[PDB]
Scaffold this motif. Structure first.
Motif, mmCIF file in Angstrom:
data_model
loop_
_atom_site.group_PDB
_atom_site.id
_atom_site.type_symbol
_atom_site.label_atom_id
_atom_site.label_comp_id
_atom_site.label_asym_id
_atom_site.label_seq_id
_atom_site.Cartn_x
_atom_site.Cartn_y
_atom_site.Cartn_z
ATOM 1 N N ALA A 32 0.821 -1.204 0.000
ATOM 2 C CA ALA A 32 0.000 0.000 0.000
ATOM 3 C C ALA A 32 0.857 1.257 0.000
ATOM 4 C CB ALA A 32 -0.939 -0.006 1.206
ATOM 5 N N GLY A 33 2.012 1.220 0.673
ATOM 6 C CA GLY A 33 2.887 2.380 0.700
ATOM 7 C C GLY A 33 3.427 2.770 -0.662
ATOM 8 N N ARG A 34 3.528 1.814 -1.582
ATOM 9 C CA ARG A 34 4.039 2.089 -2.918
ATOM 10 C C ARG A 34 2.950 2.482 -3.905
ATOM 11 N NH1 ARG A 34 6.648 -2.844 -1.861
ATOM 12 N NH2 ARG A 34 5.647 -3.898 -3.633
ATOM 13 N N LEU A 35 1.689 2.478 -3.489
ATOM 14 C CA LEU A 35 0.573 2.742 -4.380
ATOM 15 C C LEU A 35 0.015 4.137 -4.141
ATOM 16 C CD1 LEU A 35 -1.311 -0.664 -4.267
ATOM 17 C CD2 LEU A 35 0.211 0.208 -6.062
ATOM 18 N N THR A 36 -0.649 4.666 -5.170
ATOM 19 C CA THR A 36 -1.292 5.964 -5.074
ATOM 20 C C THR A 36 -2.560 5.945 -5.915
ATOM 21 O OG1 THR A 36 -1.043 8.348 -5.443
ATOM 22 C CG2 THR A 36 0.150 6.866 -6.938
ATOM 23 N N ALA A 37 -3.569 6.675 -5.448
ATOM 24 C CA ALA A 37 -4.863 6.649 -6.108
ATOM 25 C C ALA A 37 -5.408 8.061 -6.259
ATOM 26 C CB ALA A 37 -5.867 5.777 -5.339
ATOM 27 N N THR A 38 -6.306 8.212 -7.229
ATOM 28 C CA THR A 38 -7.168 9.378 -7.337
ATOM 29 C C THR A 38 -8.519 9.007 -6.745
ATOM 30 O OG1 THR A 38 -6.065 10.114 -9.368
ATOM 31 C CG2 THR A 38 -8.214 11.071 -8.872
ATOM 32 N N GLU A 51 -15.378 7.692 -5.807
ATOM 33 C CA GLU A 51 -14.863 6.903 -6.920
ATOM 34 C C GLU A 51 -13.346 6.914 -6.823
ATOM 35 O OE1 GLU A 51 -14.921 8.300 -11.007
ATOM 36 O OE2 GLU A 51 -15.922 6.443 -11.622
ATOM 37 N N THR A 52 -12.755 5.736 -6.656
ATOM 38 C CA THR A 52 -11.319 5.583 -6.484
ATOM 39 C C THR A 52 -10.726 4.962 -7.738
ATOM 40 O OG1 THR A 52 -11.566 5.300 -4.096
ATOM 41 C CG2 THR A 52 -9.500 4.572 -5.092
ATOM 42 N N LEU A 53 -9.730 5.627 -8.309
ATOM 43 C CA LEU A 53 -9.044 5.152 -9.503
ATOM 44 C C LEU A 53 -7.663 4.681 -9.069
ATOM 45 C CD1 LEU A 53 -10.016 8.161 -11.775
ATOM 46 C CD2 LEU A 53 -11.355 6.093 -11.282
ATOM 47 N N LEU A 54 -7.422 3.375 -9.177
ATOM 48 C CA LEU A 54 -6.207 2.747 -8.669
ATOM 49 C C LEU A 54 -5.676 1.799 -9.735
ATOM 50 C CD1 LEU A 54 -4.165 2.172 -6.458
ATOM 51 C CD2 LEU A 54 -5.754 0.497 -5.497
ATOM 52 N N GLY A 55 -4.551 2.163 -10.345
ATOM 53 C CA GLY A 55 -4.038 1.381 -11.459
ATOM 54 C C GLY A 55 -5.094 1.223 -12.533
ATOM 55 N N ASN A 56 -5.361 -0.029 -12.906
ATOM 56 C CA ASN A 56 -6.395 -0.364 -13.879
ATOM 57 C C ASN A 56 -7.698 -0.787 -13.210
ATOM 58 O OD1 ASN A 56 -5.369 -2.706 -12.828
ATOM 59 N ND2 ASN A 56 -5.368 -3.837 -14.771
ATOM 60 N N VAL A 119 -5.097 14.978 -9.722
ATOM 61 C CA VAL A 119 -5.134 13.620 -10.241
ATOM 62 C C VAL A 119 -3.802 12.960 -9.918
ATOM 63 C CG1 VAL A 119 -5.347 12.184 -12.303
ATOM 64 C CG2 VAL A 119 -6.814 14.191 -12.030
ATOM 65 N N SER A 120 -3.867 11.726 -9.444
ATOM 66 C CA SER A 120 -2.677 11.016 -9.013
ATOM 67 C C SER A 120 -1.948 10.390 -10.200
ATOM 68 C CB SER A 120 -3.054 9.928 -8.011
ATOM 69 O OG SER A 120 -2.032 8.958 -7.890
ATOM 70 N N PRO A 121 -0.640 10.166 -10.072
ATOM 71 C CA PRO A 121 0.055 9.335 -11.057
ATOM 72 C C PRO A 121 -0.517 7.927 -11.028
ATOM 73 C CG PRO A 121 1.627 10.590 -9.732
ATOM 74 C CD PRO A 121 0.282 10.760 -9.087
ATOM 75 N N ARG A 122 -0.406 7.232 -12.153
ATOM 76 C CA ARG A 122 -1.010 5.914 -12.298
ATOM 77 C C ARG A 122 -0.073 4.846 -11.747
ATOM 78 N NH1 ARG A 122 -1.809 1.961 -16.639
ATOM 79 N NH2 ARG A 122 -3.922 1.073 -16.488
ATOM 80 N N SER A 123 -0.495 4.179 -10.677
ATOM 81 C CA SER A 123 0.256 3.036 -10.181
ATOM 82 C C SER A 123 0.232 1.898 -11.195
ATOM 83 C CB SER A 123 -0.308 2.554 -8.843
ATOM 84 O OG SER A 123 0.096 3.399 -7.785
ATOM 85 N N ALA A 124 1.298 1.104 -11.189
ATOM 86 C CA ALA A 124 1.427 0.016 -12.153
ATOM 87 C C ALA A 124 0.331 -1.019 -11.930
ATOM 88 C CB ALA A 124 2.802 -0.639 -12.039
ATOM 89 N N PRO A 125 -0.392 -1.425 -12.978
ATOM 90 C CA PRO A 125 -1.487 -2.391 -12.786
ATOM 91 C C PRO A 125 -1.039 -3.729 -12.223
ATOM 92 C CG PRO A 125 -1.662 -1.282 -14.906
ATOM 93 C CD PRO A 125 -0.302 -0.964 -14.372
ATOM 94 N N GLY A 126 0.205 -4.142 -12.479
ATOM 95 C CA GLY A 126 0.707 -5.358 -11.860
ATOM 96 C C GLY A 126 0.832 -5.236 -10.352
ATOM 97 N N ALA A 130 -1.365 -7.373 -7.580
ATOM 98 C CA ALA A 130 -0.706 -8.126 -6.517
ATOM 99 C C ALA A 130 -1.162 -7.651 -5.140
ATOM 100 C CB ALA A 130 0.814 -8.015 -6.658
ATOM 101 N N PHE A 131 -1.426 -6.351 -4.997
ATOM 102 C CA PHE A 131 -1.918 -5.819 -3.731
ATOM 103 C C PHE A 131 -3.322 -6.338 -3.418
ATOM 104 C CE2 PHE A 131 -4.382 -2.288 -1.790
ATOM 105 C CZ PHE A 131 -3.851 -2.370 -0.519
ATOM 106 N N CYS A 132 -4.236 -6.258 -4.388
ATOM 107 C CA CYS A 132 -5.604 -6.719 -4.155
ATOM 108 C C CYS A 132 -5.638 -8.202 -3.805
ATOM 109 C CB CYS A 132 -6.466 -6.451 -5.388
ATOM 110 S SG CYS A 132 -6.689 -4.690 -5.806
#
Ligand SMILES: O=N[O-]
Ligand SMILES: [Zn+2]
Length: 168
Positions: A32-38, A51-56, A119-126, A130-132
């Motif tokens: 979670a520390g490496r991720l960022t969301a809008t 509405e949370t936008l997290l990777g893909n 708007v946040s930078p897009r975290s890598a979908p991989g 893996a987080f989910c």
């Protein structure tokens, strides 16, 4: 000010003391520390839609007083006092030019975060996938015995609260 509606950048680095207070394993706290969301917040009446936008991934939640929260209770939400509480955890929020400021309180926890608008930078979908998946394992393994944590429940201003079902 009184309307917190907007788009905010929510990085996992801003909530690490909270994740530790949730008794999450080192891998989940670090992921979670490496991720960022809008998070797009819409406050209507006594309701907050998110509405949370997290990777893909897109997650949608709605915060209302009495909303059921999955475990393995109910959400207390008072918009007039800008307070949310459930179980041992409580939070207070206020909006400003610097963004959405939230204070998270529980036994052993007193943590503040400010989420900048935009708007946040897009975290890598991989990494998101893996987080989910790792959060899902933790939830299921922890039934052989806390909230049923959602990814947008941890990568969000109103963490750890995530109403709704596990599905959209
Ligand atoms: O620290 N990510 O497994
Ligand atoms: Zn969810």
């Amino acid at each position: 000010i009184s309307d917190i509606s907007g788009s905010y950048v929510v990085p996992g680095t801003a909530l690490q003391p909270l994740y530790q207070a949730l008794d999450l394993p080192a891998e989940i706290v670090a992921r979670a520390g490496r991720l960022t969301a809008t998070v797009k917040v819409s406050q209507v009446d006594g309701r907050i839609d998110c509405e949370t936008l997290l990777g893909n991934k897109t997650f949608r939640t709605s915060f209302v007083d009495g909303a059921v929260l999955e475990t393995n209770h109910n959400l207390s939400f008072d918009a007039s006092q800008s307070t949310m509480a459930a179980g041992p955890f409580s939070l207070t929020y206020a909006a400003s030019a610097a963004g959405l400021e939230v204070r998270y309180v529980a036994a052993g926890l007193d943590h503040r975060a400010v989420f900048a608008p935009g708007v946040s930078p897009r975290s890598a979908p991989g990494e998101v996938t893996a987080f989910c998946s790792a959060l899902y394992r933790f939830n299921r393994e922890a039934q052989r015995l806390n909230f049923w944590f959602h990814p947008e429940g941890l990568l969000g201003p109103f963490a750890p609260f995530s109403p709704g079902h596990v599905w959209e």
